[PDB]
Design a protein around this ligand. Sequence first.
Ligand SMILES: [Mg+2]
Ligand SMILES: [Mg+2]
Ligand SMILES: [Mg+2]
Ligand SMILES: [Mg+2]
Ligand SMILES: [Mg+2]
Ligand SMILES: [Mg+2]
Ligand SMILES: [Mg+2]
Ligand SMILES: [Mg+2]
Lengths: 169, 294, 112, 72, 159
Amino acid sequence: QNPMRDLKIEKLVLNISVGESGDRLTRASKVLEQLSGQTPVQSKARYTVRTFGIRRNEKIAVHVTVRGPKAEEILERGLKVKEYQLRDRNFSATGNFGFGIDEHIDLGIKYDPSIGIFGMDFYVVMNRPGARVTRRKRCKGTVGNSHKTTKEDTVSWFKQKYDADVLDK
Amino acid sequence: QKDAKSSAYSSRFQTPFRRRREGKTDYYQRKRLVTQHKAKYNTPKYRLVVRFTNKDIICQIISSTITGDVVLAAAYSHELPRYGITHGLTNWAAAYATGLLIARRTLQKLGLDETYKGVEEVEGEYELTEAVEDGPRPFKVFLDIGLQRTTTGARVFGALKGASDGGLYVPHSENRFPGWDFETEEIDPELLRSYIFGGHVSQYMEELADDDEERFSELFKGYLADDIDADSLEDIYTSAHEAIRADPAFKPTEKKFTKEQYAAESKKYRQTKLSKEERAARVAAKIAALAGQQ
Amino acid sequence: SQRKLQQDIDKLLKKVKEGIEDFDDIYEKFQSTDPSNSSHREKLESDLKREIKKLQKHRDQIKTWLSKEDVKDKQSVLMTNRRLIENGMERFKSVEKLMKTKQFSKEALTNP
Amino acid sequence: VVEGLRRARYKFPGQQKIILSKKWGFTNLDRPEYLKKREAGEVKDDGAFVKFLSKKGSLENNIREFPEYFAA
Amino acid sequence: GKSHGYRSRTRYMFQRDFRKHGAVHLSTYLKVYKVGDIVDIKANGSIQKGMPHKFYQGKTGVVYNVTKSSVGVIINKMVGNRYLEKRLNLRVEHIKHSKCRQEFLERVKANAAKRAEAKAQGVAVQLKRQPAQPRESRIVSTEGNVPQTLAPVPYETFI
RNA sequence: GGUUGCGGCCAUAUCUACCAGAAAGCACCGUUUCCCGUCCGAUCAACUGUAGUUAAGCUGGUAAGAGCCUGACCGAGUAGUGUAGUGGGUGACCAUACGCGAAACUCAGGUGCUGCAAUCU
RNA sequence: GAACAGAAAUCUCCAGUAGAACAAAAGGGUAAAAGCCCCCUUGAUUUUGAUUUUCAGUGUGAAUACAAACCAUGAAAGUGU
RNA sequence: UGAUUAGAGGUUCCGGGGUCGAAAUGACCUUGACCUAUUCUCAAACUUUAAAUAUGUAAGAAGUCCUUGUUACUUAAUUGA
RNA sequence: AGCGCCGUGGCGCAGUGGAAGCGCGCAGGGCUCAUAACCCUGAUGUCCUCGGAUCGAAACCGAGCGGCGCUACCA
Ligand SMILES: [Mg+2]
Ligand SMILES: [Mg+2]
Ligand SMILES: [Mg+2]
Ligand SMILES: [Mg+2]
Ligand SMILES: [Mg+2]
Ligand SMILES: [Mg+2]
Ligand SMILES: [Mg+2]
Ligand SMILES: [Mg+2]
């Protein structure tokens, strides 16, 4: 039936994969911390690759995970930039989705010439209550099939919320 | 079409132990716990098994045999109403009281209670049950916290402290008790005593009742219904401790029924297996309907 | 015989040392050519090229010696001689690139 | 084909025998057993071989294939 | 050159088995060994400490020493023209109790019970085992068992 | 008989797809002052048992289910093999005598049992 | 599945009995680990003995299990020569 | 695990060809791979399974049972060894 | 047959884990009446093939292909 199987936002992860380390990475991290209210975490390259100009253990990206009401606040702040319009490609087969934006000033962030301009990748992980069966330490289990979120119910949720429309296929 | 497993995979799959599949036992820890110095031939090794569920604390004294584990004595948090604790049956003080109760219970049923009185005047100091001379050694038991995280302030160590102050000899250091300052490697006894007597919930009750009354009515509703204010829980915990030291004798319930009386209704409710002949009849009817051209 | 081997070891080591020595004087005279004398500059380049080719050949022999020949005692001096040959090699490479670069070629014009 | 195999036998060392098998082709069933199996619908041809219906397995797939055997 | 290490030719011997890899069950640690017990040696590849040499795999010996996590066993090794006694310190994961010894102890107490019983009657217990004696006479009937005649079969290809 | 804690043997217990689950118990669940830990009170920690829900977990059942397990005078006394011959055969190898004796295959059946303690219409 | 970002950069979910990794040859062994990350450390310590392999039951090398100390870690059982 | 024969059914938002094509997360057909269910033949350094022959031990008096003596070992304990 | 070397631009050759160059040729422009010479520039590679180690190499370690050189003695 439908007692407490409502699709809530588990988390929103904001990723910024910079081409290199240094001042630009620190500036992107300052963008992320003034946006999210939390300090972000940097991510090193898994291996060397010459055509992208990165070495192993280089700190080439920075991301942050946001939960709670601030998650949907930043999400609607990005959705109004995306015109409340998303491709169905943007929705995963497991029920999660995401979208990338450029030029983060669209989110109402007052520009400072110190930090500069950065594009981001939003990804939204959705689930139902009872998701800690797979996350807890003791008596770890797997979520049932009728409780698994998927693309059809998450696009129905996303359309009945936000008054949004999905794009063609 | 996607979530499929091959017959070779299912034939080569080695299932773990059943408790591992259930996710309830760490066998790596169990081997180090239950094994004995072989020159102590049949000497049992005793585990203080402390488990925390929602709404309950389970304390057991358990030895191990080859056919299974054997319980000396158990103490649950839901029988603290015998001793005057009605609310907060999973907090730190309830863990301490359960540890003290199972310690006194095992000491009484072993006869080691008139000696090894434990700590009567509780003040929050760190000390173990020392062996009294000219007499028997104290009963030795080791913790089995299971998969629970060792953490400074965790109430498994409140159960530890309760069992140790009850007169049991359980080996431990003090760097996991609340009040252990990290940079100054010492224990603060007064914060530990406050945690024993529930100061950490009484302070919350006060700093909620002063400003946010809707939360203080949502939770702590039972304290409001039973006129329990913040300062009283210290003395009801002291009275529960002295009642525990008065009689840990484990009066059980009257059960309201019999084993077969429960079993009749549950046997009526449980689903049964489908026998071979009726399974064959089922598949024959499935052939006659599905494959019988509708 | 290990004796005949170590004999030719010592022979190549003294040949390498005198080759380094008549490389270094050509190097410093290249740096002191008074670069107006461009003919003498190019002569000094082509003169130290022969010496570094001789040392390169000796280095290949040292490579084979350390690989297969069971030198059995003198890994140290064979390695130090190899390090000196290769440092003279990159010295010659810096010299020869410095003369080979052209003043308005694209490699000169992008980054001084 | 007996003469072809007899001609091919000269190219081999040792002794070889030419045996007419009682099996239907490259299968493992005898001729009348395969005949009484194929008059019903429990055979289903493949590229060159043939798949058989077994009493084991899911009834749904067993009826999805071999429908003529189940159309009794 | 030749190779005779401590674990030469132990490839399949110290393999674990099919589908019982991983940790060992707790009965091996819960079992109690005493001085004079008779134990069989079967090495466990999962436990690398205290392993027996490959010669002693499947060998049966007598316990002479009990330590914290190990057991001293005495084996008779055939060396040259005589046996030598070999003292082995083996962790208990490579050791199990011999079942023949306890089945002999049950036979001992059963013989004791028989003797103690029949001492009150004097009926000549005859406590020794006896081999399989030749079977004595019997009369087999044909009622519902008329003999069925068999014959050798001719040759057929069967391909 | 159900359930919880601790287990023993470690798939007859696992896996895939559905269905059901009185009571209680577990569970999801609610909160962030305190101890504590995280980029994130998601995990971990603490508090409440209050606001709710059996949706999931968990238990059970179903499936000519996969897998697994047991048995067969099913294959087959076959393959192989110890011993014997001044046995056969140019040889390769193969029969016979006294003995031991499989695996796959096929068919049939089954799909956790159980220990200590506590609790439940 | 997610801007630049593509076959390969970073992030998220699902499946995943090991198809990876464990300095090196190959072979065993290992999944709340023996793998990866983090914290603390020096037990890679002292005193001599016993035992296993090679074997003459000699040596050398390597290894095993205890005893007597002094320590490390961990809540602890324990583990560490 | 590795080797290996032959077809069948499929999958390309995703191999190479042509065709209808301006192209299209378009269409038809050809050929390669990837998957599914089959099929033929194999392994000293592959294996679920697994013999025969060889191989270790035991079949008591130095044994068993009952009772209670020693210890500085061991146990919470006259508990065990 | 064994051993050792070599294989890089069109030709002859260098080349050490952060990774392809020297000379002559070739192309464009200039000078010259014109061509050489000369001046200013530019382009040029399956690093013999195949696989592996490495985070990564032409280099390190293997399989062959091709071409060279040394030895093949005592009767
Ligand atoms: Mg642990
Ligand atoms: Mg084996
Ligand atoms: Mg070691
Ligand atoms: Mg660990
Ligand atoms: Mg030795
Ligand atoms: Mg030690
Ligand atoms: Mg020109
Ligand atoms: Mg000209």
